């Protein structure tokens, strides 16, 4: 399921964290690796993987084991890889919130025919908080309804 290009990218990342070159990373380095991949595992999920890949008590994680963990992560993606990536076309600055100005910029970039009032209304409809912006939770809720 993983492509050889994804595999080469993961090899570059792993080598960047396998600084001493022994072919393995330690079990505490793994948390940092995963957070540096732009992924957000819960400490529970992290500890689970930790104890699983280090069942033999050797502390070491080689590159095939890292790839296996990544494959299992790819299939266990909470089936929301589309909504996560669709959020990012609107959150231009990547700060975790879609602002009315950001939505306006997108709807003008992509040639959509909405007025600035229609854009404000998309925002106010999706913005359940009423804080003026759309967070990821609100975006997901709007999408799944």
């Amino acid at each position: 399921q993983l492509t050889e290009e994804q595999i080469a990218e993961f090899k570059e990342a792993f080598s960047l964290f396998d600084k001493d070159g022994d072919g393995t990373i330690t079990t505490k380095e793994l948390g940092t690796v995963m957070r540096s991949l732009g992924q957000n595992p819960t400490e529970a999920e992290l500890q689970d993987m930790i104890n699983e890949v280090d069942a033999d008590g050797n502390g070491t994680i080689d590159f095939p084991e890292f790839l296996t963990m990544m494959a299992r992560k790819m299939k266990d993606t909470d089936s929301e890889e589309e909504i996560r990536e669709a959020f990012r076309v609107f959150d231009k600055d990547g700060n975790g919130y879609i602002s009315a100005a950001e939505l306006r910029h997108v709807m003008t970039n992509l040639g959509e025919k909405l007025t600035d009032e229609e854009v404000d209304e998309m925002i106010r409809e999706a913005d359940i908080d009423g804080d003026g912006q759309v967070n990821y939770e609100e975006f997901v809720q709007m999408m799944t309804a």
Binding site: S36, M74, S99, A100, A101, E102, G132, A145
Partner: protein
């Protein structure tokens, strides 16, 4: 519950067909690097550091006067391919000449404070909302130097500078939103700061500058109240400023005409706009009301707006508002000096007092006003206000006015009781002391203008003047003063 889903999906699919605007630069072929990202939270005042993976071009694609720019890909999307192929494009910026590391962190602090101010502007329901791009720092630990870079997401579209931090405003089809935003930040912060240097794509702003009352934070771009003066010199209040209830800054007639002289169907209101408001109006009359309401202990120097008007005066005198072949506008300079003095800036009160009185003056030294009874009256009234507010020079001048009539208001007469009061007030402050004491002693010896003769007080004041002359090492003068004291006591 959501009657707008289909617009979202339209945009998502069109972004899906959209190509990566950086595809031909092939950043994905670059060797991945590891960096530490520092992000600032301006509500909590806290830094958060984490590790990121980046692919950065080896050569910059642009540079301003201060910073070089590098195309960069921040690597997410390791498990699933980039749907929109341009969501990981970032611009990294490095100072051309070496700087202290903390300049980078202070630039981030600036940008995020400006972002908070943009959110506050949006809370007042403007016709067009704004947003300041988030910016962070990446530190390349492995490279020699541990180089720091600013990092912002790439935004495609026409880049426009709407105003500068030095007074520039677009000399063409003006947009109302950036200027109204800057003015709003001046009012809503209570004149403590202003956000200018508005620039970017649409209303997605980046690299703003903040001018603050103190002038000390937010880098060398903080021009303090001089920056607010530069903004308000060129600012024309528009329908958005009015819709939010912003009061216009008091400009002179010539400045008013130049601002109206600088077309298109600009931005249109909707009716939801709320009134701004801590918040302070930008007009001198409303600020006079604010100072009157405040329980002042005869206090002055409490107006930031007055300091802005004073900075305007000094920019006028300095030739900042002059074109290359003209003479600088003295009329508007005096207009703004009047406004500064009526807002309690003691330098302005003293300067106008000296100027209207035909006395020498430092501020606006080369300006001369007509010798009129009105102007002489105004000059004395200003000098009296300055004396009542603690200025020793004005105290002595007012004393001599009530004494000899020199520079006295034509509405008033000589009065040696008042003159003695002001001489004494000046003498209590820690133009020589013995000279003023001897002048008092002489007035008591002679009497006149409401002051009856007092030989004993006159002798005592001559004695105090002689002792002060001894403290000044003027022994011969002390002997003359003692002779005058005995002469006065012999009158009895």
């Amino acid at each position: 519950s959501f009657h707008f889903k289909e617009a979202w999906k339209h945009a998502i699919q069109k972004a899906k067909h959209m190509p990566d605007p950086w595809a031909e630069f092939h950043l994905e072929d670059i060797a991945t690097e590891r960096a530490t990202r520092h992000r600032y939270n301006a509500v909590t005042g806290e830094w958060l550091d984490d590790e990121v993976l980046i692919k950065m071009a080896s050569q910059p694609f642009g540079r301003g006067a201060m910073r070089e720019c590098f195309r960069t890909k921040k690597l997410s999307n390791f498990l699933h391919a980039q749907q929109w192929k341009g969501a990981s494009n970032y611009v990294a910026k490095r100072y051309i000449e070496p700087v202290d590391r903390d300049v980078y962190f202070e630039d981030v602090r600036l940008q995020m404070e400006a972002k908070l101010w943009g959110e506050e502007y949006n809370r007042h329901k403007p016709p067009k909302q704004v947003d300041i791009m988030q910016m962070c720092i990446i530190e390349l630990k492995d490279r020699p130097g541990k180089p720091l870079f600013h990092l912002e997401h790439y935004i495609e579209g026409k880049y426009i500078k709407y105003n500068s931090n030095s007074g520039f405003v677009r000399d063409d089809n003006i947009r109302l939103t950036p200027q109204a935003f800057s003015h709003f930040t001046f009012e809503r912060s209570g004149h403590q700061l202003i956000v200018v240097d508005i620039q970017g794509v649409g209303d997605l702003y980046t690299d703003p500058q903040i001018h603050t009352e103190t002038g000390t934070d937010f880098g060398d771009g903080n021009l303090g109240v001089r920056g607010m003066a530069l903004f308000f010199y060129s600012h024309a209040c528009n329908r958005i400023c009015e819709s939010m209830g912003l009061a216009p800054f008091d400009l002179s007639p010539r400045e008013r005409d130049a601002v109206n002289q600088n077309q298109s169907a600009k931005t249109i209101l909707r009716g939801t706009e709320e009134k701004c408001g801590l918040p302070r109006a930008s007009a001198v009359a409303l600020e006079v009301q604010r100072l009157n309401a405040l329980d002042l202990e005869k206090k002055i120097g409490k107006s930031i707006l007055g300091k802005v008007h004073l900075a305007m005066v000094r920019y006028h005198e300095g030739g900042r508002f002059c074109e290359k072949g003209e003479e600088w506008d003295q009329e508007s300079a005096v207009f703004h000096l009047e406004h500064a003095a009526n807002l309690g800036e003691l330098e302005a009160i003293v300067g106008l007092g000296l100027m209207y009185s035909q006395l020498p003056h430092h501020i606006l030294a080369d300006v001369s006003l007509k010798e009129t009874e009105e102007n002489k009256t105004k000059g004395f009234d200003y000098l009296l206000k300055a004396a009542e507010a603690g200025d020793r020079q004005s105290m002595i001048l007012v004393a001599r006015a009530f004494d000899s009539g020199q520079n006295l208001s034509p509405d008033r007469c000589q009065d040696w009781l008042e003159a003695l009061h002001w001489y004494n007030t000046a003498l209590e402050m820690t133009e020589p002391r013995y000279m003023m004491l001897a002048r008092e002693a002489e007035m008591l010896f002679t009497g006149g203008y409401g002051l009856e003769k007092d030989p004993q007080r006159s002798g005592d004041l001559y004695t105090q003047a002689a002792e002060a002359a001894m403290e000044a090492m003027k022994g011969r003068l002390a002997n003359q003063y003692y002779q005058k004291a005995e002469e006065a006591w012999a009158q009895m």
